[model samples]
Target: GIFGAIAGFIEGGWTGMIDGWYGYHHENSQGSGYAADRESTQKAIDGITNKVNSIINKMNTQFEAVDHEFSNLERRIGNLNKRMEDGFLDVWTYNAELLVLLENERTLDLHDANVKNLYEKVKSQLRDNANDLGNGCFEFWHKCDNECMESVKNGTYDYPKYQKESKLNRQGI
Candidate 1:
């Protein structure tokens, strides 16, 4: 009878062990672990998403600033090209007019001596004027070049001053 009681206790304990194992397996199969893991993973994903969005926003803002600067640069280049073309055309027209005046051979020969004298005088005046203009241009350019180099060395160059001087020299030409 003692042996029989002892065997009954052992059998009961085995049954209880099997039941606990089954319950634990069932809980795992019902997705408890997966749900916990998913919650933590979703939080991480949210953090990364927020960071990515912030970076994208920053990049877009910088791109807008760059676009504005490029537009301003394009406008400035267009205006400069137009001014250069106009100045070139003016010089060309003046040279053409002078060429026409020189082509009148009979008129040139009749007053050759006086014309020659006048031509020499005008030529001398033109040469002097050209020399003055050249020297002015050279001085302006030298000043600008030196200032630019100095600015590069000391980081104190003024852009407005450079632009003003450039415009003044161009007008003088």
Candidate 2:
């Protein structure tokens, strides 16, 4: 019985609150053109909702592209691994080419943070693989990759930033 009383009180309060709102608006409807104002207000809300939905849809599509590109990149890495296994490619040369490829992908659209992160993942994996093979393996790393290895070993590695700094230095900036 107490719960029922509390429920009735709450229900009445909510109804009274809504009725007060309606009465105020209804009384001012013709005097202040509030009814028309309400329509435009609703339309603005609707427009905002649609714009947010459109942006989310665009992001979903972009992530789809990123996912597809990620898959393609893995396939390429797989092929590279296969080539190395078959003795057609050395680990050093493979890592060098892979770095160049990853740099190209990374700078193409770093706006896609996901894609940029994927490139970083690949670069890290390549570096780890080289390190796993010991120092002699890295000795054969190309000149560019030697610099990368030093940065990685020193824990100052940031491939994207490294590329940017290198490019800036080359331009005497």
Candidate 3:
């Protein structure tokens, strides 16, 4: 079964868009090695997610900053989708737009200076995890561990590897 476009969108167009928020990961052969690697990765992930999500929650309730930020990103993504549907955009550029917008979501200024500091912590985690995993999956692993493992187990992950390569080329990698 093919996944829907909305799932792809929620997963940040398979471009690691949710990295700063979701503790998503993918690895092969769900053995001790994969479990240990994923657990370790998620440890630092949760550390930053809790911090950033908490402060953003406060900002959400108090200043409505978080909501507005979502609207801004959602609007951009929505328009991108519209363009794609109208044959005005291709998957390559659509993928690029999703990624750049993800950066926009992260680097955005929040309502408080101290809160922005915590937000930076999430970006730092991205760098650290990128060092752990390869740069490709670090920011762009769309499937959860189970789905990812399943994909590899059934030989379905190869096409996305090519897609990832295309994404890297766009980044001048």
- The lDDT ranking, best first, is 3, 2, 1
3-26 in candidate 2: lDDT tens per residue?
222222223212433312111111
TM-score of 3: 0.18
Q: Rate the local accuracy (lDDT) of all candidates.
A: 0.37, 0.37, 0.40
Per-model TM-score versus the true fold: 0.21, 0.18, 0.18
Point out the worst 10-residue segment of candidate 3 by lDDT.
1-10
Between candidates 1 and 2, the one scoring higher on TM-score is: 1
Kindly give the number of clashing pairs for every candidate. 0, 0, 2
Candidate 3: which stretches are off by over 4 Å? 1-34, 62-173
Predictions: Cα RMSD each: 47.9, 32.8, 21.8
Which clashing pairs does model 1 show? Answer: none
Which residue pairs in model 2 clash with each other?
Answer: none
| Model 3 lDDT per residue over 1-173, tens place | 02221232123323433333323335444532222223433655675567667655644432111212336648887666565555533554565577557644553322122223332433443332232232224343332255544443343544444455445544654
Pitting candidate 1 against candidate 3, the one with the higher TM-score is 1
